[PDB]
Structure 1
Amino acid sequence: SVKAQYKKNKHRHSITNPLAVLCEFISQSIKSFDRHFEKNRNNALDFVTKSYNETKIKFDKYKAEKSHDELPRTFQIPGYTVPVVNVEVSPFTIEMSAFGYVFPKAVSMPSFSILGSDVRVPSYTLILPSLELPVLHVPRNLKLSLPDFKELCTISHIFIPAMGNITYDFSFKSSVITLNTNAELFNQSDIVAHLLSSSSSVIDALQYKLEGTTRLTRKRGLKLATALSLSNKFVEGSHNSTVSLTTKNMEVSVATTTKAQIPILRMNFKQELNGNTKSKPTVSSSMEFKYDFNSSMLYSTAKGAVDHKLSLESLTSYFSIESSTKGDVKGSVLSREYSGTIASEANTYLNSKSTRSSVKLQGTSKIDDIWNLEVKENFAGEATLQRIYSLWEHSTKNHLQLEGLFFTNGEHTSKATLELSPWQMSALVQVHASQPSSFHDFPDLGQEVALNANTKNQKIRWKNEVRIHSGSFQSQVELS
């Protein structure tokens, strides 16, 4: 028996949404434009008086005006009526002075009469001097102020569905299986959802319970709170997501909790996310993961934990970022122990004056007591508006082989640093930190560079040493 009944409701809420906040907003720019206009007039002022200086002595005194005068250009447009869209166009008059060359004159245009609020007629009054008289003076005080655009500042009906209940139940009868899944949804004003699935069977794996709630309001922010829970013998899930919008501040809480029920692999993790943000945005992320491997047939097992913690501080003053994670793991494979772990720490501080970055890394892993000691994978660098410093990776490698004659191996560098400042340049590089071993005395190296520069002051030291079997060579170079 399958149910899909649905009570149709075409009615909807029409929430009025104001737009006048936008309507005044651009209008605010207009007022600035208004004063900007008089600034333009000031620029025009810097010419107008001078232009007056070029008019009188050419027109008022010299006989060069009032010769074959013409009627001033006056163009009239009668108003019109449009009943379909109901628009009244007022008569419009355009005036140019006849004297000169189509020089603009005083223009004045009011607003028209239309239907609704779609466009705005540019009603203004600009006054400009006429060349028919020698006196030219643009009124700086008289500016041009256009009316603000009224593009439906209060007319807007956001449509919100006013719905019934979405009903869908699935029920089936048999002799070995019994499923009764019910899904319902409430849509009258807000978002209220819940799912229920009931499974009954002879087999334990086929019999379980699934349920979940989902709520989302709209009246006061979009506050969501969805939690899930699975009742199964093999999957035990508890997922918790709540997003709260209190119309002033947002909150996110993700409590993810699920565990595995596999006999040969006991995995158990955990996820928590709280993106809290009230005054300064911040991130609280810490990822948790545990696992348990055991293979009797393959005589292998693995047991470790992997975790991370993320810290973020979006502070208005500075921004410091914190991250670290651990990849710990242990195991035994064919009567041979397995090890290996990871440690991370990347500290990166930023500022408008100085920045620092140091990366600390740990990868000490061994394969059955072999090839280990990978330590000190750190490097640091600092940049200031007075000094620069860098010391990059200078790790060490010292590993042991358990097959043969206990062969030792590993080659690495020493510290090697760069120092920068006005009048002081330093390059102090010691490198070639090798490890001699068996098989005819593996070479032992080493190299030192001392560069010290203060413009003309130049100290250069270069030392090298090489060791092979039953011999050696060393060389030095010095510039003072």
Structure 2
Amino acid sequence: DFLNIPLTIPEMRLPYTIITTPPLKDFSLWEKTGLKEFLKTTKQSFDLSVKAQYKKNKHRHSITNPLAVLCELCTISHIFIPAMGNITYDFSFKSSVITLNTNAELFNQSDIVAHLLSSSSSVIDALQYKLEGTTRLTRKRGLKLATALSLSNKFVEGSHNSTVSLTTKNMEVSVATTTKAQIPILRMNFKQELNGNTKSKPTVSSSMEFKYDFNSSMLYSTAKGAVDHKLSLESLTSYFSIESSTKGDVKGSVLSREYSGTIASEANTYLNSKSTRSSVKLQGTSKIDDIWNLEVKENFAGEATLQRIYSLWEHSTKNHLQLEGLFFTNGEHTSKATLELSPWQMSALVQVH
């Protein structure tokens, strides 16, 4: 309260100088500097409470380990599953402007159940948020885990979902994460999907999607795009197929001049006891300010069979134009050229330049 007192200071002339400082009227530092308004208080009262108790349980669950598999003390050895009690830890602090209360609870009777709760409250918008987290793992019939996380923040929206389940015969993995940024100038959204599954033959899905929204008004540069990928993987016993393709997409403008970029690729590989093949196609198509365009066809193709061999490597085409001066052009590139090999026959044709 003393600091809230609006002290009046008279006009004084400092010794050894001709300076006469101005008087101060109703100088309530706690209020005239905005602290009274900012913190909503005329003083400081702080309460901190921390709890870290633990009801100790030193017992364990001893699961006999079946060494009989090797025998064909086949059954005298113990897999230890602790009988620990709950671990409790609550943190709570109090104040006028900020209030934090986070509770973490962990259960360890025989399985694992972990839950977290963080509560933040403040006069400031960003300082107020909610975070929740639950992780559950069961071991009675193998390890089956399910983790889900959610964040409640003004600028970040985090949703994360991981669940690894073992049904005592089959293997399931799935990752479903979705989170987006809320930055004004650069708004972003990404999304993760990964579902590796193995009933008899493993099957894996890989789709990565990303979006980005950019605009720099001060720099007068703006661009939008998305880079997204899809991978298909099939490790079948009969044969093994791997398929991958990606698309680097973006459009933008800089100082009233357009920025163009779009990259697409298709990667394809095939394997088998008799024949294997792999052909990957590329399009580097892009240009800056509508200049130097047509980055095209950097593709290749190859095939190998027990009977024969074939190859086609770097057929391409290019044409890039300058939009300054007298519009000089150059797009040099190779023409298609191949190779085929068979018994008794050797054929090699090459066209280039």
For Structure 1 versus Structure 2, the TM-score category normalised by the shorter chain is: 0.7 to 0.9
Q: CA shift at 1:426, angstroms?
A: 0.9
User: Residue 22 of structure 1: SS of its match in structure 2?
Assistant: helix
Distance 2:232 2:306 in 1: 27
Please say if 1:280 is aligned against 2:201: yes
Cα-to-partner distance string for 1:351-387 (whole Å, 9 max, x where unaligned): 1101111110010010111111111111111111111
Q: CA shift at 1:229, angstroms?
A: 0.2
Q: CA shift at 1:179, angstroms?
A: 0.1
What are structure 1's unaligned runs of at least 5 residues? Answer: 24-150, 431-478
Cα-to-partner distance string for 1:133-175 (whole Å, 9 max, x where unaligned): xxxxxxxxxxxxxxxxxx9211012111101110100000111
2:124 aligned partner: 203
Distance 1:318 1:413 in 2: 35
**Residue number among 158, 163, 173 corresponding to 1:252 in the alignment:** 173
Cα-to-partner distance string for 1:11-41 (whole Å, 9 max, x where unaligned): 1111112111111xxxxxxxxxxxxxxxxxx
Distance 2:86 2:296 in 1: 63
Distance 2:189 2:86 in 1: 38
Q: CA shift at 1:346, angstroms?
A: 1.2
Cα-to-partner distance string for 1:277-323 (whole Å, 9 max, x where unaligned): 10110110000000000000000001001100010001010001000
Q: Could you tell me the percent identity over the aligned residues? A: 99
Distance 1:351 1:251 in 2: 27
Question: Which structure is higher in RCO with an 8 Å CA cutoff and minimum separation 6?
Answer: 1
Please say if 1:325 is aligned against 2:246: yes
Normalization by structure 2: what TM-score?
A: 0.85
What are structure 2's unaligned runs of at least 5 residues? Answer: 1-48
Distance 2:66 2:225 in 1: 58
Cα-to-partner distance string for 1:407-428 (whole Å, 9 max, x where unaligned): 1111111111111111111111
| The structure with more strand, counted as a fraction of residues | 2
Distance 1:187 1:253 in 2: 25
Detail structure 1 runs of 4+ shifted over 3 Å in the superposition: none
Higher mean alpha-carbon deviation, 417-426 vs 292-301, is at: 417-426
Normalization by structure 1: what TM-score?
A: 0.63
**Residue number among 303, 306, 313 corresponding to 1:382 in the alignment:** 303
1:176 aligned partner: 97
Q: CA shift at 1:405, angstroms?
A: 0.3
Q: CA shift at 1:180, angstroms?
A: 0.1
Cα-to-partner distance string for 1:170-214 (whole Å, 9 max, x where unaligned): 000111000000000000110000000000000000000000110
Q: CA shift at 1:273, angstroms?
A: 0.7
Q: CA shift at 1:395, angstroms?
A: 0.7
Distance 1:370 1:405 in 2: 13
| The structure with more helix, counted as a fraction of residues | 1
Q: CA shift at 1:341, angstroms?
A: 0.9
Distance 1:359 1:159 in 2: 52
Q: How many aligned residue pairs are there?
A: 305
2:52 aligned partner: 4
